[PDB]
Subunit: 140 residues, 7 copies
């Protein structure tokens, strides 16, 4: 195959999403999260050479972070916080890049995945009011 699919962590809930393009990798990713519910609620992605925003979940949280990614820039560290099980949720993300940039969204009070690394190509999971489930997708 062309792509590495990291494990989707969290619950079975929400509307499914899959954001990926062969015409370009992820150039921007935004996480929205709340202190009220200590969850991720909403994620937006942009791809190289495309102004259109791909969004999932409900932007109801009181914080957001954006990581912008240079064309030649990779994810060298990547950690997702979540509550496990059928009624699980994603609670937080830490990404670190080949250029020393990092972002930190939300909370890490239960379970963690340390994911595959590489060129971030897309995301996949389930979202409604919250991010139920998140899986990263990388190139080779």
């Amino acid at each position: 195959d062309n792509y590495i699919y990291s494990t989707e962590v969290g619950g079975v809930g929400g509307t499914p999403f899959t954001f990926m393009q062969e015409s370009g990798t992820i150039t921007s990713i935004k996480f929205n999260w709340s202190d009220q519910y200590k969850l991720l609620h909403h994620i937006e992605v942009k791809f190289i050479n495309n102004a259109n925003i791909y969004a999932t979940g409900d932007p109801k949280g009181n914080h957001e972070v954006i990581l912008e990614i240079d064309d030649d820039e990779t994810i060298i560290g990547s950690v997702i916080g979540y509550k496990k099980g059928n009624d699980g949720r994603c609670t937080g993300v830490k990404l670190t890049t080949s250029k020393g940039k990092s972002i930190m969204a939300g909370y890490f009070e239960e379970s963690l995945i340390t994911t595959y690394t590489g060129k971030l190509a897309g995301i996949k999971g389930g979202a409604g009011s919250d991010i139920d489930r998140l899986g990263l997708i990388f190139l080779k």
Copy 2:
């Protein structure tokens, strides 16, 4: 054009501004901010081979920082603090350069972007009494 436009973060308010000159990159950037309102209020920029000062917003704040940038010097780290939403504002900036220089202006109490990196060429956004909206522009 043949430039990278970082996302404009903050609100829709203020008078639009675009500071860019074909005959050069940014050589000096000044941020004015207040402890009263915890916002950026005013930005001034100078370009290589141009003694003109390009200013936006109202210099009402009680603090200022200036970063001066050598001709061969790049931004390798860059973070803008902001309040999100239609009535948003820029609250702070942290820049770090290829030569270990850094500045820190204002506050980081809600949302952050970690932007693209490279040769800082210009800025763009909206300002009135405050900096409503700010986006960096880099060369390729």
Copy 3:
């Protein structure tokens, strides 16, 4: 064709061996509790094999997953345990050739710092808890 790291913990539980000629370990998951301060359950996936190999009882309130690139090795590895006949594994720390690390469970009694290299399988004893755990590496 393999290096067997020492199995640490008790003599209890049903014996298990997870290894495949088909590939190395691509994912490992540890489940542990704050109630009992033990590892309870481990799942492993191998390269080119969609089967999940599981041992123990996933009753704990925490889990961690490490995913491992095909060319990625373990360069540091520490297992916490209670020693003796009624011993248990209490925790794991792994660190990889690509700067990734995980930490599961507790380290309140005994430690092994294991051999290093390409993680190929695991071996030990499990029931309600992980009684005994040993890593297996390639040469």
Copy 4:
């Protein structure tokens, strides 16, 4: 024109000074400052191959620091503390060199500039009872 002029920071007050010599770069720089007023008061400079001492301001402060600079030694980091506006003053300086030497004079309670870097050739500004205004000058 074959020199880099860093921004003069502080007020419009004081008697203007320019210390620069065709004979060489700066070999010694001394800052005098007070805890009473939390200001720089006085600066002395010596140049390569020149026994003359160039002084400005009033040496009334209770502290002084001297940086001596080897012929081949550059400033790789430089920060000036100041009060901004017409009635402004310089409050402090931090210099760091290509050889791991640093100095720190005075206070940093309001505004900062992170200046250009390079071979320090001269200084320029305004002084009376205090250092009103200071700007560094570097070679290329």
Copy 5:
């Protein structure tokens, strides 16, 4: 004669042991120690290409550590804690390897040796209820 013998530290007590094999170097070493007596009590060693476990002392302590050693891996730091004199004992060990592995057993409340370094080939000393005396053996 083509081995380096580190000093045996501790007392003259216990039954003498030497763990060394022509068959290879040490691949595993285990230290057992107590908080009750703040002593090492028991040591087990395994060698390359030899399934036999060599043990000395009484495993009565409430802690144990194992260091496993790759075939190509050396000791680059090594410190043994002991009580000196005829009635001495080994109280603790810190070993650090060419691959950034380290272990720490027991206590360091009186005397220390920082030993020779290299490929750990064997150990030698005296043990009964406690480890009376310990000496490391390296290759040349």
Copy 6:
């Protein structure tokens, strides 16, 4: 001709001294200082291939430090503490060498110089009961 004279810091008092030899560099330097007066009182220097001690001031202090300097060893960092003005004194010294050796004598409660660097050749200043004034001398 081919020596660098660092600034003499401290007061105008004391008996003048100048210790230098064309035949060789400083191989040992000793500082004596007191907690009573928080001053340097006495300095001794030895030169390469010469057992004779060159001394100034009064060894009345309750502490001494010696730095010994290998033939190929340089000073890469050097800081003298002093009280400024006509009735000034040297209060302390920190030296750091090309081989990671450092010494620290006395107190730093008023003024500092960070001196030139290089091969320490001699010293020069004024001493009586105290070290009134000290300047380092380096080669090229």
Copy 7:
């Protein structure tokens, strides 16, 4: 002749000792010290290719440290604590080696020397009940 003699620090008391052998450098050195008197009391040295133990002073202290030194291993840092004057003593030693090994014996409450560096070949000084005086000897 082929040796560097570091300064003997401490008092004039005790029986003089010189430990040196031309058939090898120091392979082991032991320092014995007390908390009672805060002094070094006793030193033992072994040389390469010589099973004889060379000892001076009275082993009455409640602590000992041993450093073992590989054939190719040098001292890169070395500090001796002492009381100065005719009735002086050595109070402590810190050695650091080319292989990252270090030891620390006794106390450092008055005077320090940072000695020459290199291959430790011998020691020299005066001892009775205490180590009155100690000086290191290095090769070239």
